[PDB]
Amino acid sequence: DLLARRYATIGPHSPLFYRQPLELVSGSGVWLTDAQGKVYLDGYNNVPHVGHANPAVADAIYQQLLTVNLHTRYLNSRVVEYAEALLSKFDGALERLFLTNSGSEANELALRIARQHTGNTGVLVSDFSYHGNTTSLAEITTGLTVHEPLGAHVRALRIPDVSGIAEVDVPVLLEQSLADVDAAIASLQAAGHGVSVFLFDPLFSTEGLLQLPSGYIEGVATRVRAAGGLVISDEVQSGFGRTGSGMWGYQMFNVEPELVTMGKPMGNGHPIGAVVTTAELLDEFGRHNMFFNTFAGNPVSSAAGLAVLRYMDQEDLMAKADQLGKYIRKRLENIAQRSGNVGSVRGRGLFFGIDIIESDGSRNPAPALTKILIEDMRERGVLISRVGPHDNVLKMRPPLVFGREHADILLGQLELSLASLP
């Protein structure tokens, strides 16, 4: 029995989705098949950015595996080709790269570059976030359970959300949120840490897909820079065109970060991450450290990353996601008008969510109804999930090859699922 064999090797704690674990044995594009032969529409996975079993990615890997696959202490063209392609997707002073093998490795390295450059240790993060699984990341984690107490060098911020707030009240929410930033900064200075970084997910997805007031990110950047710190945009959830309106999530705001980190989608499932930064910051850190990552930038990893960028450009996926997101938003707003169990509609491009609420007039978060909806949608052949501190934001985030025919399948089942609640 597979579950028992898993528990005897990797253990019973490593997480599994659903009340009954699901065994997935094959996939193609947006479609997955279980060990019983049931077929599902993927409304969840972002690692297969260009679709399950994409054959252009598979072929690029295979052909390089039959050539050579050594570390970067020997010259080889593939890593340079990939670095050129990836950096062509950045403007401004973001013109150099460190490659890694995961998003956690990228965020660990970005915090290390910042601590050395600033001479400060303080970290500003959201109060319900997750950026990876190393010791330095565990000490700043607020959105998942870790044994490490929150570090004395960390201040957690309540990131503002305008969802459901009267427009007249927005400027005061912005003002109070920026005063909380000044107070965090002043506390870190008084206690001798100073300010090293502000680190954020531009979609604020773990937090419940927040809609920020205009001027908050710009305001935080100005205050952090007056204090001698840097801004890191973690693009693991929001990058590679997921938002539709730009390649990188930070482009939704009036900010150009000094450091950008990435992972998940980048190699369609191959282990790849990166830190994109300025010439000054890369040169300084290399003068000061004999830094080397053995697997980073090998020719096969580089072939995989090049095939992902080439495929997304040839198939126009970012522009498609921008157009389709406009359609999905209209459909979800109609659904919210018709269901007493739906609150705000959140997100853009191919990252959407809806708040699930009691229909008794309270508008209280309904996490038990949300779990019903996730399990019912699985029975109906659709894989979705949830996010947020009240466990009630129903999330829709498929591979970036998801089209209008797929949107109509997902949205039709979701309507039937909502209609079946009490």
Ligand X SMILES: *Cc1c(COP(=O)(O)O)cnc(C)c1O
Which partner, ligand X, a copy of itself, none, binds residue 234 by CB below 5 to 8 Å per kind? ligand X
Q: Which of residues 251-270 bind ligand X (CB under 6 A)?
A: 263-264
CA dist 141 → 134, 250, 283, 416 (Å): 10, 21, 30, 37
Q: Which of residues 126-145 bind ligand X (CB under 6 A)?
A: 131-133
Window contacting ligand X (CB under 6 A); options: 23-31, 33-41, 248-256, 290-298:
290-298
Window contacting ligand X (CB under 6 A); options: 99-107, 345-353, 375-383, 397-405:
99-107
331's tokens: 């459909």
The burial of 195, by beta-carbon neighbours within 10 Å (0-12 exposed, 13-18 middle, 19 or more buried), is given as buried
Instruction: Judge whether 237 is annotated as a binding position.
Output: yes
Q: What distance in Å separates the CA atoms of residue 341 and residue 363, rounded to the nearest whole number?
A: 8
CB 277 to a copy of itself: min, Å: 10
CB 15 to a copy of itself: min, Å: 6
The torsion defined by the Cα of 323, 326, 330 and 331, in degrees rounded to 10, comes to 50
CA angle 279, 235, 399 (to 5 degrees): 135
Q: Which of residues 180-209 bind ligand X (CB under 6 A)?
A: 201
212 vs 387, beta carbon nearer a copy of itself? 387
Instruction: Judge whether 103 is annotated as a binding position.
Output: yes
102 vs 211, beta carbon nearer ligand X? 102
Which partner, a copy of itself, ligand X, none, binds residue 201 by CB below 5 to 8 Å per kind? ligand X
Q: What distance in Å separates the CA atoms of residue 199 and residue 181, rounded to the nearest whole number?
A: 13
SS3 (DSSP) at 94: coil
157's tokens: 């911020």
Instruction: Judge whether 88 is annotated as a binding position.
Output: no
Instruction: Judge whether 206 is annotated as a binding position.
Output: no
For residue 123, what are the β-bridge partners?
A: 154, 197
Q: What distance in Å separates the CA atoms of residue 275 and residue 262, rounded to the nearest whole number?
A: 7
Which partner, a copy of itself, ligand X, none, binds residue 237 by CB below 5 to 8 Å per kind? ligand X
Beta strands in 279-397 (DSSP E): 342-348, 351-356, 382-383, 385-387, 393-396
CB 284 to a copy of itself: min, Å: 10
CA angle 246, 44, 159 (to 5 degrees): 55
CB 316 to a copy of itself: min, Å: 24
Q: What distance in Å separates the CA atoms of residue 401 and residue 195, rounded to the nearest whole number?
A: 41
CB 166 to a copy of itself: min, Å: 37
Minimal CB distance to ligand X: which residue? 103
145 vs 362, beta carbon nearer a copy of itself? 145
SS3 (DSSP) at 31: strand
Q: Which of residues 337-396 bind ligand X (CB under 6 A)?
A: none
Feature table: binding site: 103-104, 237, 294
Binding site members for pyridoxal 5'-phosphate: 103-104, 237, 294
Where on the chain is the footprint of ligand X (CB under 6 A)?
A: 102-104, 107, 131-133, 201, 234, 236-237, 263-264, 293-295
